[PDB]
């Protein structure tokens, strides 16, 4: 699937059903909702940054070269620009993990529909299933709800293949 769908503004991952009756864009509810739950929890958990406690820390040379100041200075300046870099990495990290998580959900749904349909359809296009037989609106729901049944439409589909075979 190398092309995005603008019409699927309800959820991320969706199916474009096409029957003799018509064509629509139906999002998969469980995939989108579960993914949204996981992504949101990642976001809120990443926020936890738990900076070091405010240990009321400051010193200075005290006119006697008490570099505790330049030590404590570096220590705070060195904790930042290190944690900041480290945090930039964690953002970039989580960014990719969300992106590949998305690609994985795509491929999982495509395998779901392949497993149900099997040889009752042709894999054609960028993730499109051309039904040899006619999947009714209900039948389209059954594939979506995971309740599709191969045998009922099997024989009809088989004869159609043999016609073009």
């Amino acid at each position: 699937i190398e092309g995005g769908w603008t019409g699927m503004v309800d959820g991320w991952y969706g199916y474009h059903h096409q029957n003799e009756q018509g064509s629509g864009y139906a999002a998969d509810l469980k995939s989108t909702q579960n993914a949204i739950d996981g992504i949101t929890n990642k976001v809120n958990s990443v926020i936890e940054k738990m900076n070091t406690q405010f240990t009321a820390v400051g010193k200075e040379f005290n006119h006697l070269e008490k570099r505790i100041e330049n030590l404590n200075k570096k220590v705070d300046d060195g904790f930042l620009d290190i944690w900041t870099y480290n945090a930039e990495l964690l953002v970039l990290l989580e960014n990719e993990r969300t992106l590949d998580y998305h690609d994985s959900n795509v491929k999982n749904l495509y395998e779901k529909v392949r497993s149900q349909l099997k040889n009752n359809a042709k894999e054609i296009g960028n993730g499109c299933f051309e039904f040899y037989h006619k999947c009714d609106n209900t039948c389209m729901e059954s594939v979506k709800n995971g309740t599709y049944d191969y045998p009922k439409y099997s024989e009809e589909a088989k004869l159609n293949r043999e016609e073009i075979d």
Partner: antibody
Amino acid sequence: QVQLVQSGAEVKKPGASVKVSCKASGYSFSSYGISWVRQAPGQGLEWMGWISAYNGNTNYAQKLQGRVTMTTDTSTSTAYMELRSLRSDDTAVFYCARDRPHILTGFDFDYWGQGTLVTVSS
Amino acid sequence: DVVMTQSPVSLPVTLGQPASISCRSSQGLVYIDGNTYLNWFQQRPGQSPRRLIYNVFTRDSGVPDRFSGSGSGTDFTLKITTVEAEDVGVYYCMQGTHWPYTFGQGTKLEIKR
């Protein structure tokens, strides 16, 4: 503008189905969703469910999942909440509120309805 | 599941005494959209609930500047300056971004003392 008209007050006995209606207008009904809230007599506000007119995406609250059934008539822009099984504890007033339809988008109970109280005792 | 704890349930005030209502969540309340979601509500007794602050920092069209939603982390607050008389009533936190939507308990106001 703001017009969330709830149904009339309803009185039933335990174990009978109840049907509340919230008819909406005076404001664009562009698939905007509708959620239903319950306030026990002079007690807390408990969210019951949400339905997206854009889709059929119901989210009934775990506590009450089997009994509760929600519907939408886009043509009349009216939502419906139906509690199949009634209880004396369920006796309360019910409230409606608009919600955003897309799960991707957040939520907006911008408009609230007129409280339909429902009494349930034998 | 989400737990909205409302710290100051009982809140008597005197006219013109900015008072605050604290809502504390069990988990962070940010969402994929980007914005947090704690639209505060007010149900003036005898009337149906009303919305105040959209998200965490957005006053509603017909809301007095007195009402002000605040807070960034799990602990959010709502401070109303010049507490007036229609201001009295019950208030609830907003449902968490989690689909478990949680209004939490209520906070009641008094006119004077």
